[PDB]
Amino acid sequence: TLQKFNGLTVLPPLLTDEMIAQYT
Amino acid sequence: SMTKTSVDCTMYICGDSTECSNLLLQYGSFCTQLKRALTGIAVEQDKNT
Amino acid sequence: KCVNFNFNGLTGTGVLTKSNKKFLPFQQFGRDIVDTTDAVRDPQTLEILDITPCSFGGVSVITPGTNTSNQVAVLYQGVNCTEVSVAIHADQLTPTWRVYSTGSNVFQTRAGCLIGAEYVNNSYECDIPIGAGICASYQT
Amino acid sequence: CVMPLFNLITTTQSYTNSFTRGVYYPDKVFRSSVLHLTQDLFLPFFSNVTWFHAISGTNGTKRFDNPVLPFNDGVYFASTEKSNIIRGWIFGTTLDSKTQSLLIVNNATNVFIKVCEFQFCNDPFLDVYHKNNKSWMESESGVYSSANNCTFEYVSQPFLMDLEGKQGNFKNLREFVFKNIDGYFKIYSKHTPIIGRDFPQGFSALEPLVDLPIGINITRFQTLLALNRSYLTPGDSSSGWTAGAADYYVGYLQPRTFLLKYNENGTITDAVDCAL
Amino acid sequence: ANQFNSAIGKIQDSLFSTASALGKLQDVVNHNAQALNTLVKQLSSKFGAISSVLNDILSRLDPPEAEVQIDRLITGRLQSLQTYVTQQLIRAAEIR
Amino acid sequence: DPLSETKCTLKSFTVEKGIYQTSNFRVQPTESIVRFPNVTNLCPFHEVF
Numbered sequence: 001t002l003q004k005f006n007g008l009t010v011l012p013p014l015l016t017d018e019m020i021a022q023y024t
Numbered sequence: 025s026m027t028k029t030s031v032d033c034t035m036y037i038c039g040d041s042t043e044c045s046n047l048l049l050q051y052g053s054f055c056t057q058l059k060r061a062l063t064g065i066a067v068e069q070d071k072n073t
Numbered sequence: 074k075c076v077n078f079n080f081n082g083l084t085g086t087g088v089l090t091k092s093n094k095k096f097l098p099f100q101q102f103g104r105d106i107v108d109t110t111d112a113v114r115d116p117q118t119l120e121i122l123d124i125t126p127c128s129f130g131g132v133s134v135i136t137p138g139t140n141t142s143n144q145v146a147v148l149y150q151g152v153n154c155t156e157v158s159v160a161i162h163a164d165q166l167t168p169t170w171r172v173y174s175t176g177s178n179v180f181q182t183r184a185g186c187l188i189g190a191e192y193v194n195n196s197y198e199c200d201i202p203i204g205a206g207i208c209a210s211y212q213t
Numbered sequence: 214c215v216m217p218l219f220n221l222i223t224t225t226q227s228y229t230n231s232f233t234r235g236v237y238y239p240d241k242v243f244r245s246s247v248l249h250l251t252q253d254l255f256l257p258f259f260s261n262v263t264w265f266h267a268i269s270g271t272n273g274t275k276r277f278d279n280p281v282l283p284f285n286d287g288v289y290f291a292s293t294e295k296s297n298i299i300r301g302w303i304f305g306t307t308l309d310s311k312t313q314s315l316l317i318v319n320n321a322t323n324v325f326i327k328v329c330e331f332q333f334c335n336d337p338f339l340d341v342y343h344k345n346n347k348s349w350m351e352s353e354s355g356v357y358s359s360a361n362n363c364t365f366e367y368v369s370q371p372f373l374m375d376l377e378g379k380q381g382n383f384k385n386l387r388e389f390v391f392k393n394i395d396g397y398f399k400i401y402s403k404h405t406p407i408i409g410r411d412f413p414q415g416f417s418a419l420e421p422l423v424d425l426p427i428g429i430n431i432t433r434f435q436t437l438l439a440l441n442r443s444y445l446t447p448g449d450s451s452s453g454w455t456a457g458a459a460d461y462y463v464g465y466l467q468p469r470t471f472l473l474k475y476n477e478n479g480t481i482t483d484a485v486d487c488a489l
Numbered sequence: 490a491n492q493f494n495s496a497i498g499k500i501q502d503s504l505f506s507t508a509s510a511l512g513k514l515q516d517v518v519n520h521n522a523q524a525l526n527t528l529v530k531q532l533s534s535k536f537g538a539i540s541s542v543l544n545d546i547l548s549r550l551d552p553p554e555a556e557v558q559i560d561r562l563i564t565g566r567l568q569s570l571q572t573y574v575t576q577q578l579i580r581a582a583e584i585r
Numbered sequence: 586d587p588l589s590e591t592k593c594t595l596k597s598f599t600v601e602k603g604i605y606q607t608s609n610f611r612v613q614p615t616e617s618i619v620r621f622p623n624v625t626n627l628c629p630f631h632e633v634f
C-alpha cells in the first residue's frame with residue numbers, strides 16, 4: 001500500500017478485490 | 025495489472041482558458057491519440073487480470 | 074460553492090472551505106507537494122480557506138448498439154450522484170444534454186454515477202463492462 | 214559630526230565557522246511536511262564568516278571599530294550584545310549625496326528607514342546620552358550632515374525587541390539576512406536566545422520581516438555604533454564616552470541549492486546543503 | 490504432512506522480512522505515482538514563457554505577444570503528456 | 586443527446602454495443618469573487634486640490 005487536481009483521473013479495475021479473492 | 029489512468033488534454037494543458045484551447049485546436053488530433061492510447065492501456069489491464 | 078477567486082493577484086477556480094490548516098504570520102498561500110495551490114489567506118479577515126477543484130471527470134455513454142436500440146446510459150466517472158443531481162438542479166454541468174432521471178434511474182457505482190440503467194438484484198455474466206464489478210446489458 | 218578623541222584600536226577580523234545558520238524562508242508559500250528543493254541565494258553550510266568586536270576597556274582604551282564592508286549579492290548579519298550597541302545600517306554605492314543611499318536606524322522603540330542622498334562623515338555615529346540627567350535619548354547630528362533629494366521615508370515598528378531579560382545569555386542572538394532582488398530590498402530576521410556563550414550549534418529558520426520597493430543599486434554597506442556619555446559601569450569615575458561589549462559576524466550569500474524540510478506546521482525544521 | 494505444515498507456516502514470515510520478492514508490486518505502484526506526480530508537476534515549468542500560469546500571461550501582455558508565450562506553454566505541456574503516454578505504453582507492454 | 590455526441594466522436598452514424606469515453610464533464614463556476622487587503626493609506630489628493 002502506497003494528481004486529481006488537473007485533468008488526471010484514475011479508473012477503477014473491472015474486477016474488485018472481492019472478485020479476485022473469489023477466483024483465487 | 026497496473027493502475028488504469030485517463031487524461032483530459034484540454035483540462036491538463038489549457039485548463040479553463042478559452043483562447044488557450046483555441047490555439048490547442050490548431051495542433052489537430054494530437055490529443056485523440058493520447059486518449060485512445062490510455063483507453064487501450066486500461067482495457068488491456070482488465071484483460072490481463 | 075464553485076467560484077472563481079482572485080486573492081491578491083492569485084487567480085483560480087474552485088470551492089473554498091473553512092480550514093483547520095494554520096499558516097505562519099507571513100505566509101499567504103499554501104502549495105501541495107506538486108506545487109499546486111491548496112490554501113489561501115483572505116487578505117481582509119485573515120481567514121484561511123482550502124481550495125477544492127470544482128468536480129470534474131469523464132463521461133462514458135453505454136449503448137446497446139444503434140441498430141438494436143437508441144437508448145443510452147450515461148456514467149459520470151468518479152463522482153457521487155448527489156453532486157451530479159445538485160449540479161443539474163443548478164444548470165452547472167458542462168455537457169448540456171442531461172439525461173432524464175426518474176428516481177429509479179440514478180445508481181451509484183464505485184466507478185461513478187450511472188443514469189439511465191435500472192439496477193437488478195440478479196447477477197449475470199458481464200456484457201458491457203462499466204467497472205468496479207458492475208456491468209450493464211440490454212435485457213428485459 | 215563630532216568624534217571624541219580615543220585611543221583607537223585597529224579592528225580584529227576573526228574567522229569562524231558558520232555552522233548551519235542563515236536558512237530563511239525562500240517565499241511566502243506554506244508547505245506541510247514536505248521536502249522542498251530550492252535554488253536561491255543561501256549562506257553555505259559550514260561556511261566561513263568574519264567576526265568583529267566592539268568593547269570599551271578599563272585601561273582607557275576603547276575598541277572603536279567601524280570598518281568598511283562590501284555587499285556583493287546578499288549579506289548575513291549576526292549580533293550578540295547586552296545594550297543594543299548595533300543601532301542600524303547604511304546601504305549604498307558611494308555613501309555620499311551624489312547617489313541615493315538607504316539608511317536604517319532603531320531609535321529605542323521605533324524604527325526609521327530612509328532612502329535619501331545623505332552626506333555622511335568619516336565616522337558617522339549616533340549620540341546616545343542623558344538629557345536632564347534623567348532621560349536616555351538619542352541624536353542623529355553625527356550621522357549625516359544633511360539629507361537632500363529623498364524618495365522613500367518610513368517610520369514604524371515601535372518595538373523594543375530585547376525585552377524578556379538576560380536570564381541565560383542576553384537573549385540577543387540577532388540574525389538578519391539582506392537581499393536585493395529585481396529592485397526589492399528584503400530583510401529577514403530572527404531573535405534567538407543564547408544557551409551557552411557564543412554561536413550555539415542549532416537550526417532555526419529566519420522569518421521575513423520587511424520588503425521595500427526601493428529599486429536602486431546596493432554594493433557597499435556598513436553598521437552603526439553609538440557611544441554613551443559615561444554612567445554605564447557602576448563604580449567608575451572615568452568621565453568619558455564608553456560602550457558595552459558587543460560582537461557581530463558577517464557572512465555572504467552564495468547561489469546554492471538547499472533541501473528545506475517543512476514540518477506539518479509550515480515551519481522549516483531542517484535543511485540540507487546540496488554541495489557540502 | 491508435518492514438513493508441508495512447517496513450510497507453509499514459514500511463508501508468512503519469509504514473504505516480507507526476507508525482502509527480495511514482493512518489491513515488484515510496490516515498484517509498480519510507486520512508478521505509477523511517480524509518473525502522475527511528474528506529469529502534474531510539469532504544469533509549474535515555464536518552458537521559456539514569462540510564467541507557467543495561463544491567466545498571468547493573459548493579464549500581462551497583449552494578445553499578439555501573448556500568443557507566443559501561450560504556444561510555448563502548449564508545446565511544453567504537450568511534450569509532457571506525450572512523454573507520459575509513451576512511458577505508460579512501454580510499461581503496459583512489460584506488465585502485459 | 587449522448588447518443589448523437591457518441592456518433593460525432595466516432596464520426597459515424599452507426600454505433601455498436603459498448604461503452605465509449607465520450608467527453609469530460611465539469612461543474613461550472615457560479616459567480617466570480619475578488620479579495621484585496623484594504624485601501625491602505627490612499628493618496629491625499631484633496632489637500633493638493
Ligand SMILES: *[C@@H]1O[C@H](CO)[C@@H](O[C@@H]2O[C@H](CO)[C@@H](O)[C@H](O)[C@H]2NC(C)=O)[C@H](O)[C@H]1NC(C)=O
Binds near residue numbers: 116117118
Ligand atoms: C481591512 O479592513 C477591514 C475593515 O472592516 C478590517 O476588518 C476588521 O478587522 C478587525 C480586526 O480583526 C475586526 O475587529 C473588525 O470586526 C473587522 N471589521 C469588519 C467590518 O468585519 C480588516 O481587519 C482589515 N485588514 C487588515 C489586514 O488590516
Ligand SMILES: *[C@@H]1O[C@H](CO)[C@@H](O[C@@H]2O[C@H](CO)[C@@H](O)[C@H](O)[C@H]2NC(C)=O)[C@H](O)[C@H]1NC(C)=O
Binds near residue numbers: 476478
Ligand atoms: C504544531 O502546531 C500544533 C497545533 O497548535 C501543536 O500542537 C499543540 O501543541 C501544544 C504544545 O503546547 C499542545 O498544548 C496542544 O495540545 C497541541 N494541539 C494539538 C491539536 O495537538 C504542535 O505542538 C506544533 N508542533 C511543533 C513542532 O511546533
Ligand SMILES: *[C@@H]1O[C@H](CO)[C@@H](O)[C@H](O)[C@H]1NC(C)=O
Binds near residue numbers: 154155
Ligand atoms: C458521495 O456521496 C456519497 C453518498 O452520500 C458519500 O457516501 C460519499 O462519501 C460522497 N463522496 C464520494 C467521493 O464518493
Ligand SMILES: *[C@@H]1O[C@H](CO)[C@@H](O)[C@H](O)[C@H]1NC(C)=O
Binds near residue numbers: 228259260261262
Ligand atoms: C576561512 O578562511 C580562512 C582564511 O583564509 C582559511 O584559512 C580557512 O581555512 C577558512 N575556512 C574554511 C572552512 O573555508
Ligand SMILES: *[C@@H]1O[C@H](CO)[C@@H](O)[C@H](O)[C@H]1NC(C)=O
Binds near residue numbers: 320321322349350351
Ligand atoms: C526616539 O525615541 C525617544 C525615546 O522614546 C523619543 O523621545 C524621540 O522622540 C525619538 N526620536 C525620534 C526622531 O522619533
Ligand SMILES: *[C@@H]1O[C@H](CO)[C@@H](O)[C@H](O)[C@H]1NC(C)=O
Binds near residue numbers: 306430432
Ligand atoms: C547599477 O545597476 C545597474 C543595473 O544592474 C547597472 O547597469 C549599473 O552599472 C550599476 N551601477 C553601478 C555603479 O554599479
